[PDB]
């Protein structure tokens with residue numbers, strides 16, 4: 001997260017850190033708890049992941065430095081990638097992780113609601129991106145989870161900024177005209193969380209962008225409301 005600030009414990013309890021364990025253990029992507037056995041993340045996270053066997057899902061984590069050889073994690077039973085996914089920039093960048101067992105929800109591990117049936121025309125004005133990613137283009141994975149409030153932009157404007165890409169109704173963009181706040185390397189797969197009527201909704205999945213927080217180059221997110229039928233079909 002560029003232009004952001006550190007979070008405190010329990011502030012984003014649906015945020016997870018997905019680690020790979022090959023060839024060495026490291027943060028791979030963010031993700032979001034949406035059910036006791038289900039994480040929603042980006043499909044591009046699994047490029048070159050040989051199988052679910054090498055994945056570890058850590059919930060309840062503020063600082064990456066909390067993760068030690070005895071820290072409890074969830075195994076991944078299945079990675080479910082959207083059938084039409086090819087690469088992040090061309091859409092369908094969404095994946096479900098089915099965990100091996102059920103998350104018992106606690107103060108630090110909670111689900112976030114999907115965008116609701118009948119809220120497709122809501123204008124979200126309180127949206128936040130969170131993650132352990134870079135604070136600049138040439139940086140490092142951060143120890144402490146970062147947060148940044150970012151405004152949504154219209155799909156018309158977003159397409160104008162990315163005339164070499166197909167910005168469809170299945171994407172949503174977010175960023176300041178002048179730049180300065182955005183996701184960056186290591187934030188992908190995590191949530192774009194928006195609060196409406198004091199309830200948090202998973203509006204986007206962090207997907208791709210041109211550089212980090214550049215002027216007139218918003219971050220591009222998978223538009224989760226357009227995938228709710230797909231999620232419900234896979235989680236039942």
Ligand SMILES: Cn1nncc1-c1cnn([C@H](CCOC(F)F)c2ccc(-c3c(-n4cc(Cl)nn4)ccc(Cl)c3F)c[n+]2[O-])c1
Pocket residue numbers: 027028029044045046047133137141182183184185186187188206207208209210211212213218219220221
């Ligand atoms: C894990 N890690 N550890 N050290 C490095 C990494 C690492 C490296 N790239 N990434 C991912 C892709 C691969 O993900 C996983 F497979 F590695 C990635 C790709 C794109 C974005 C992104 C960007 N944007 C553009 C530029 Cl340039 N930089 N960022 C801008 C806006 C939005 Cl909205 C975005 F989403 C974020 N991320 O995270 C993780």
